[PDB]
Symmetry: D2
């Protein structure tokens, strides 16, 4: 139900081996670890969760952009990119969180389909 | 060797049934039709060309964004989105031209892989 | 030293009356409230801080995009856009945090200048 | 009535000395040169046209992104960014064409205001 895709706007490539952490907002308003991984050779991270586990609520996707750029020998601006959203059962069932990275800028979009 | 992908930033969806025209720059500097189609249900347009036909040169991808938005009952700013680039044999072999559409804005990126 | 500018990609206009909250990471690793304000009719937010107050640190600029879109009667995807960065670690700089908003997508860019 | 502003997403800075060519579609469907200029040290290009001259029509703003990146010694993907739009068809408006550049990607947004 949840896929994360990361692209590199400098090189025109997938952003490979980027660490991604997903958190779910707990009742006390803290962020609890939910799932994590590293993007693949295609810049994608599949298998984070299942339909049963991905219940409605507020989630945060943190993308470790700073490590990515530093490994390329580039100093970037942001500490990470964060994407915070509510999962809603009314809407379509599959969420792709896409991010497009540059050293001083990033874009993110949600593609939500059935 | 060439794929075009179009997303809708307003609805968080693929942009479906968007007309896309590809042109190749001729020796006289005019744009000659090269390939065309409409994006699919996944917002993608596959099968535009073959490796044999997609020789080095300058290409233009014109995306009919204005018709897309008008069919959704929205008045948009741009007449179309245009992506102009050189195909280069030195670089990786597969080109994805991605576009992210809003009524008054668009983003485009090239993902070039082997 | 810190300015925030927000545009609306749907309207082709400044994004007006967007709430922005800035935090700074404290010694204990918590996010301490640092400054807040709203974008004006030009989509800009000036006056958040001073050169003296804007010391080195890790800052988070929270742009309340959901509140913006809901005040316009639109159901958007994100809760907010968060921009997190180290500032002033090589001496004072001027930071513009720009954001471009759509209901299911946003962009942010930093322009950093040395006075 | 027409301003162009360009940022560099790699540097986190204005994109300086970017060449911009504006065309207007003629009666015969050709692109007629309309105005041109370069972005300043602030990444802005002012003074392209006048209220009188900027009549209704279909305009193309060509931002010479390859020339910009090649002047910096970088091999980018696109030849240029083209922004094509109908202007002034409900009376005079003020247009800002903004662009954010990276070597393999760009964004453009229009801010349209009624004076």
């Amino acid at each position: 139900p949840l896929m994360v895709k990361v692209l590199d706007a400098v090189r025109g490539s997938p952003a490979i081996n980027v660490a991604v952490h997903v958190f779910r907002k707990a009742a006390d308003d803290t962020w609890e670890p939910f799932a994590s991984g590293k993007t693949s050779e295609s810049g994608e991270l599949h298998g984070l969760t299942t339909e049963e586990e991905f219940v409605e609520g507020i989630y945060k996707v943190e993308i470790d952009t700073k490590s990515y750029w530093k490994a390329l020998g580039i100093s970037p601006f942001h500490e990470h990119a964060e994407v915070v959203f509510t999962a809603n059962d009314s809407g379509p069932r599959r969420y792709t969180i896409a991010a497009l990275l540059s050293p001083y800028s990033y874009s993110t979009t949600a593609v939500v389909t059935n």
